Amino acid sequence: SSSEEEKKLYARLYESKLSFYDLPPQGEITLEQFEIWAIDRLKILLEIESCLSRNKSIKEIETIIKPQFQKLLPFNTESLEDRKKDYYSHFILRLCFCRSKELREKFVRAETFLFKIRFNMLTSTDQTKFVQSLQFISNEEKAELSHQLYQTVSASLQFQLNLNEEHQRKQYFQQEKFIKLPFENVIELVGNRLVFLKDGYAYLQQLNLLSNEFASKLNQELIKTYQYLPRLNEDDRLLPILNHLSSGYTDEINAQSVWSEEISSNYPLCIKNLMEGLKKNHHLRYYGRQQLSLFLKGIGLSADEALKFWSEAFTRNGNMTMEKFNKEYRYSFRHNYGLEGNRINYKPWDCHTILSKPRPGRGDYHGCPFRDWSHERLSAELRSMKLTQAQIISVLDSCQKGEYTIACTKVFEMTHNHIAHPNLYFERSRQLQKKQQKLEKEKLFNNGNH
Amino acid sequence: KRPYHPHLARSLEQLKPFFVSIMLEEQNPWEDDQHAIQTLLPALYDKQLIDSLKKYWLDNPRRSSKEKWNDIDQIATSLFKGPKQDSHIIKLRECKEDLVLMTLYPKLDVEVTKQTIHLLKAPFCIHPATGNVCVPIDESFAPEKAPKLIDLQTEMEKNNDVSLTALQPFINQFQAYVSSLLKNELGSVKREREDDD
Amino acid sequence: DVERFKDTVTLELSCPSCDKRFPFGGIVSSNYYRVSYNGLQCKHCEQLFTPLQLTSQIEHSIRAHISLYYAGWLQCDDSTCGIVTRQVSVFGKRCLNDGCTGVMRYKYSDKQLYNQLLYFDSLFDCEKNKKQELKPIYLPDDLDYPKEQLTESSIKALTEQNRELMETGRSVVQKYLNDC
Amino acid sequence: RTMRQNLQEASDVLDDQIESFTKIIQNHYKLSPNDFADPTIQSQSEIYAVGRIVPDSPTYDKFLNPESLSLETSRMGGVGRRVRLDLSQVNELSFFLGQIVAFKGKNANGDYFTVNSILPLPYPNSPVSTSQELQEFQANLEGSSLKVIVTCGPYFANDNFSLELLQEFIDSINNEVKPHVLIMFGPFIDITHPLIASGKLPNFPQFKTQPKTLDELFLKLFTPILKTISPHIQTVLIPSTKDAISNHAAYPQASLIRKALQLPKRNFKCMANPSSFQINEIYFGCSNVDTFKDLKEVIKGGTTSSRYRLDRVSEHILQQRRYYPIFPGSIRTHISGADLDVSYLGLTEFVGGFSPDIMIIPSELQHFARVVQNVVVINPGRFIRATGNRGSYAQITVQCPDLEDGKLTLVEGEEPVYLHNVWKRARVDLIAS
Amino acid sequence: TRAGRNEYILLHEFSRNGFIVPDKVFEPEKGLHKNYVLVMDFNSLYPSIIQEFNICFTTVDRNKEDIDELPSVPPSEVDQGVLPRLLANLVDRRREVKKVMKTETDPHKRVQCDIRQQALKLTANSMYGCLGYVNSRFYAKPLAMLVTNKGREILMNTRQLAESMNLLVVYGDTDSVMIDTGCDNYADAIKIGLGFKRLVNERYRLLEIDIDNVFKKLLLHAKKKYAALTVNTTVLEVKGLDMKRREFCPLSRDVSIHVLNTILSDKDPEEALQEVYDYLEDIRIKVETNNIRIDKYKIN
Ligand code: SF4
After folding, report:
1. Beta-sheet pairing, A135-136 with A179-182
2. A372 alpha carbon to ligand 1 midpoint, in Å?
3. Which of B195, C75, C108, C114 is the most exposed place for a label (fewest CB within 10 A)?
4. Which atom of ligand 1 is nearest to the CA of A411?
């Protein structure tokens, strides 16, 4: 397709700033565009999910997401590239999440909430243009039923749009359009008496019905895409990105201070488990040693202090001679820091790469405790962290659903007041600790002048 | 919940003319002071008004339902004065409308309607304790008009034909209803066929 | 970006005047070349590079890499076989060694070549030059590690002065990057 | 199409080559598929077999011999297995890597396929034309003969950037020769040119603004000069994989964008590499990869060895029905090479299965023009030599078609069509540039 | 091949019933698995699908003009077809044979019963080639696609069930699924496998899968490219990793075999690895000092 024809089709599609994603995007995009747009939309959806799991109000979620919109997925722009980004990201995520039923449910829920937010941020004229772009009633029919419709919708207006004055409510109602549809499609709104009923037809709260239709259509299209996926399995190029995206949903620091309580309060439970295993056994197996070493490098421990740390931890029991440590372990610890071989500076393991680990056996301390520990044992340490029974129950409920990172964020929040990286947990804890220390110092200074 | 849903407001307007004639005169349940305290007072919103009405009715026993209904307004007017009187008047009117609905609005059995698998007694069945026939109901129906099975037997002894008994009008009414239902079913089948083409 | 280009090879320039060869690491410190306020300058003979003398070498390196990629070398996954060949069996992934179960793969994969072209592009990304995220062309133990380190403000001003040259050099790579 | 290479798709193309040639052989020799069997397994009946010539070892010496070849079978024929060849019973043959062949042989002991005879792939049918079209071409030429000039790069020497010889040639064609069509092959600005390669590009005093990219160098160095070609001479531009102006460095190679070269629409046409096209009735087959230099034969027998190499190579090109039949592609060690995009080897086959009347494959070898299997094969040589001395270009003059003169052969059938006889009607001159 | 048996039985049954007969995947998790891994046989997937959903030539209404169109399984009102009836007959006869085997005392009759049961199982599992094979006398693309889609569904819900039991699907296809039990003891692994079998049978009444191989350790690269310590008495078993033994001297093969023995032993993965390092350094010293028999250096 000529670039010009492609632009024409895309403009015919965007006549409104909002879309049902009915027709497949046509055109070619590069792999960098593919992956970057997919990851950006995925970040937006993950932030939506994290806000929802914390029972945040709709206004708070909107306020949190607006800067993320301006940064990752610009909406309400006239640029063709941003609209292309939204459409292609949506269809890439359709390809990603069609594999399993639970993924489908999470995707449709998050996408419907995103639809709701975007519709809420639109202007009333744009909303009218979008809904016009499901039969609207004539002005005569609205005039005949005006009293009943206004009586039905006055409470919804007051509570949803904060139109406290009656004059404003009437003025809005005069401009509001109504849709006539059978009450069986809007039984949910019928139950709460939010829609007017006449002769078996419900007069429309429109956002809720639009979201319901969008979710239903999205579910059906995900099912069709799942049926057509094995034909796409022949593309060696997209499969790794799709697999990664689908699984993505799931001298202050030296060798001595890393053991201190001041630094020890900040690690996540995985790191505490690895360090406890190292202290008890004076040895960590390969995966645990790698996880711990990469964390320690990521938190500021230099290479020489890392070698000192590992040698001191390993030789404490006398079972390991310094000669054996230098013969077998020194090379690997230097390699982790990019000082050996191809000098590759290995990045610290995020949560996802840790979970991609092969499951800890007997004698293993690596992995994620929230996935790899029994419920009783997790309850034991969460009690040791002075968490209440309700907080422990919430964390265990998050763990049961497979949202281990959500539970990690939860324990962070309860112990300190979305995290997907051990170094991120450490950094946030350190920043909070420094802020608290500065506040305490300011309070001490203020109390000394009276 | 306020404002009323149009169904609720329409039902209130339909029930308002009957509230006086039934409750305040024919049944007169609040003539008894204890019954008044138990059922009429708890529908009010203001504790001071409730206490004042309770004291007034204790000092003046056995006022009829209409008299108590007027006393509610009189004492509320005596109590609620100033710029805030309008809100009190509106709330009292709302409480009175809520009591009208509480007393006259349909009170359905909620279980039988919920599920498709629920069983309900077939029409024309005999009630084991009264012997009344579960006859269909028209606008003129009253419980005393339901024929009894023993009376139907007595009629059949004189005339051995169902068409000559008191059960016949109800049978005719049901037959007409069934005929109309069948005609509408044929119309719906035709409409479905037209929609499919 | 740090891990994206770990295996790419450096862009080697030849001085038109004195024939000295040196890698081009963008606007960074180097013993062999200097980017001046008025263009790229070889430090051995002080002579200046004009766009054509740079862009022709950039295009020559890109096309040499593309020709090598289309040479179609295959390598065997199996670490005990490891043969490198250009023969392609009608079953592509099958190794041509008798009984070998390794998976043949194009030695110069399109992912590697796309990474190389992206490294070339990042060399003349002005914004990437300013924040200093280019991959180093020298290890610390290299004998040619540069004796003087350029400052941040010098890098900013110099990149601003040389914007046209960097944009033209970037367009030369983008000529093939849009086709890849 | 982008720069992607997929092993499965390339293997699909390589399999399809063998399958199509199997079907062609069965049709030509009227043989049933039951007659064809798998040559990699032991059978004690003589069988028919089709496959690809490959070295018996994947890591092979640069020089092959008649005792070190194998036959690669298709997926259906032999599950992709490769069998060594026993050619002790064949005295005369000529093979090359990537050639698709048909054998009548016998694999007796499991480790060797003994070829008893060769099954030469038939030569493709020649194009034909109706009487009406030939009369229209007769009217087009106005009696006079058809003149077409073909030139090939490089156009300027290795130690300078002078196109004075090109200007001389343009003036000659404009005012004396006056051809109908002029076909120019690449490379125009060769990227393996040592001055371009080493960055030794000087300031040009005759340009008001110096070029900043090789594309601007073309626009300022060639396009003025090419614009002086007379508008009555339609000219055809065919790239090479070494053309700097091309952003498609793979064979088959997409045609240049004429607008990007700023060449006017009036007489400038850009054609793909390879390209097949008609000039009047004449069918042209043009490919810009040096098959003649690259195809290296294994040979037995005095008869074939006594033959000219060029006729053998041209017959190989005709039989394989593809302009660049060698595989794997040749390489220049890394500097340049064939740059075959194996996934699209379909596009380099003869268009429609017709053998072009005149096939032009420029070569670094000496210029030649020869008639092989009733096809005129032309190598016009390089326009200018490395040292700057005169190169060569080829002039093709074809007698105007005439149904009455008898040189056109009528093809029997209900619908009368006529075989073009270009080898009877074309005179080809190799003129020093 | 299986083609003769499948087509022949089908044509026999069809001619007998008054019918006119026609004229003549989850990618492996490469690496070392310390926990016990069980190979769970899924050969009866297709016959159980055909039997459960009453898929047959006479029950599935299909568009015979466009063979690529996917049909729908017949409703439960449709009587059992000839094909599912034959499959049910085979399964019932196999159950009868096993019931007889449980009581039988004579070794001769017991072996005969086992052979009968094996033949019945082979036919039941080969019955799909009737309608799946492209060159089959009874080929039917819509029915093959229906059965294949149902098998895909069943395999994915099998993954979900395994994850519900905190199990990891190491590798899987229509024929076998390998599960990481997460245990290091034979009894625990077998109990986990039997529990998984019970769950799969609970969700699919006609699908009876069983344990085919017990892997104490598993260094996996592909379905048929792996090494493992199989339990029957643990024994080293390698598949697809002994392709090129000729090119390596006996010393190299001895080193390789010893390393495999040590890494897959029941010792802790650090003391065994230090044993490997001691062995390797000792080998280096003997090679540098040339104290090894020259026979071990020979290469043919
Ligand atoms: S959620 Fe991530 S950071 Fe937290 S304990 Fe688990 S692996 Fe560690």
Report:
1. antiparallel
2. 11
3. B195
4. 4
Q: How was this structure determined?
A: cryo-EM
b/e burial code for range D130-139 (CB count within 10 A of at least 16 → b): eeebbeebbe
Q: Which atom of ligand 1 is nearest to the CA of A404?
A: 1
> Which residue carries 């975007």 as its tokens?
A118
Q: Could you give the CA distance from residue B142 to residue D78 in angstroms, rounded to a whole number? A: 95
Instruction: Quickly count: other Cβ atoms within 10 Å of residue B73's Cβ.
Output: 13
Distance from chain centroid for Cα E222? 14
Contact D358, D396 (CB under 8 A): yes
The angle that helices C163-177 and C152-161 make with each other, rounded to 10 degrees, is 70
- Please tell me what DSSP assigns to residue D186: S
The full length of chain B comes to: 197
- Rounded to 10 deg, the angle between the E107-126 and E82-103 helix axes is 160
DSSP B22: I
Strand-strand pairing, D331-332 and D234-238: unpaired
Handedness of CA E126, E131, E134, E136 (dihedral sign): positive
Q: Is D412 exposed, middle or buried (0-12, 13-18, 19+ CB in 10 A)?
A: exposed
Domain boundaries along the sequence of chain D? 1-125+290-355, 126-289+356-433
Q: How far is CA A434 from CA A429, D22, E158, in A?
A: 9, 78, 50
How many other CB atoms are there within 10 angstroms of residue D424's CB atom? 15
CA A48 remoteness from chain centre: 6
Min Cα distance A80 → chain E (Å) is 39
D198/C87 Cβ within 8 A = no
Q: What is the Cα gyration radius of chain B?
A: 25
CB A356 within 8 A of CB A247: yes
Contacts of C161 (CB under 8 A, 6+ apart): C37, C38
Q: How many CB atoms lie within 10 A of CB C163?
A: 11
Angle at which helix E82-103 crosses helix E2-16, to 10 degrees, equals: 110
Torsion, Cα of A123, A125, A127, A132 (10° steps):
-170
Which residue matches tokens 């490769």?
D82
DSSP line for E109-144: HHHHHHHHHHHHHHHHHHTTHHHHSTT-TT--HHHH
| Long-range contacts, A55-60 (Cβ 8 Å, 24+) | A58/A116, A58/A117, A58/A120
Alpha helices in E18-81 (DSSP H): 45-52
Closest listed residue to residue A177, CA positions, set A138, A133, A126:
A138
Quote the CA–CA distance of A234 and B122 in Å, as a whole number. Answer: 63
C-alpha span between A307 and E134 (Å, rounded): 64
Q: What are φ and ψ of residue D378, in 5° steps?
A: -120, 130
Which element (helix H / strand E) includes D375?
Answer: strand D375-379
Length of chain C: 180
Residues B136 and B170: beta-carbon distance below 8 Å: yes
How far apart, in whole angstroms, are the C-alpha atoms of residue B191 and residue B185? Answer: 10
Is residue B26 within 8 Å of residue B58, measured between CB atoms? no
Cβ contact C81:C56 at 8 Å? no
Q: Any idea of the CA torsion for A212, A215, A220, A223, to the nearest 10 degrees? A: -150
| Residue B180 CB neighbours (<10 A) | 10
CA distance C93 to chain E (A): 14
DSSP state of D48: E
D387 phi/psi in degrees, rounded to 5? -75, -10
Q: Identify which of A353, A357, A404 to mutate to test ligand 1's pocket (most ligand atoms within 8 A of the CB).
A: A404
